[PDB]
């Protein structure tokens, strides 16, 4: 996998490739690694497909129950529920998860949860096998308070490179935009992003 989430002026954008691997065989070339746990709290999944799905399903369930009793949960709260699962079951889980959401108070927020179940709040986050190849690039090109179009370009260019070098990344680039205006799904195909 290659995944990332980036905060900007109006909120946050999540991005991911669409490759699921089963050896060196591509088991699924159009996977959706961007996953809803609440209306405007989403996550990017990396690591074990089974582990991350099982985790996201439980988190979605907790937040649905949270909503019923106490109203809309904060992005921080959602990240806390992911952590609790990942940390307490660290021996049996291979899950690298980025949590991203939009409050109206807090605007865009990104929390990354690596293998051990630690939590890290960041302006942007990258993860997955393909992320190693774009630490250089992303650190050099990220700024705070980018526009929507700048942020789409940053993610598109970054994941383009991760996909280029990482054999475990590929297919389409998916993105999910999270603002006050609602929720927008974007998709970019190889013929566009490859030759960037």
């Amino acid at each position: 996998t290659s995944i990332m989430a980036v905060t900007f002026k109006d909120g946050v954008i999540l991005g991911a490739d669409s490759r699921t691997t089963t050896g060196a065989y591509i088991a699924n070339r159009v996977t959706d690694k961007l996953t809803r746990v609440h209306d405007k709290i989403w996550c990017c999944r990396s690591g074990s497909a089974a582990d991350t799905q099982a985790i996201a399903d439980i988190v979605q369930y907790h937040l649905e129950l949270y909503t019923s009793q106490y109203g809309t949960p904060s992005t921080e709260t959602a990240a806390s529920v992911f952590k609790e699962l990942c940390y307490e079951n660290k021996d049996n889980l291979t899950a690298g998860i980025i949590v991203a959401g939009y409050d109206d108070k807090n605007k865009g927020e990104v929390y990354t949860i690596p293998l051990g179940g630690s939590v890290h709040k960041l302006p942007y986050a990258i993860a997955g096998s393909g992320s190693t190849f774009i630490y250089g690039y992303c650190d050099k090109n990220f700024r705070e308070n980018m526009s929507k179009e700048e942020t789409v370009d940053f993610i598109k260019h970054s994941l383009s490179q991760a996909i280029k070098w990482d054999g475990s990344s590929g297919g389409v680039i998916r993105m999910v935009v999270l603002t006050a205006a609602g929720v927008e799904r974007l998709i970019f195909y190889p013929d566009e992003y490859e030759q960037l």
């Binding site: 996998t1 490759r19 699921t20 691997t21 089963t22 088991a27 699924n28 996977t31 690694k33 999944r45 990396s46 690591g47 074990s48 497909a49 089974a50 991350t52 291979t94 997955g128 475990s168």
Partner: peptide, 4 residues
């Protein structure tokens, strides 16, 4: 097993 499937990985991402």
């Amino acid at each position: 097993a499937p990985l991402x």
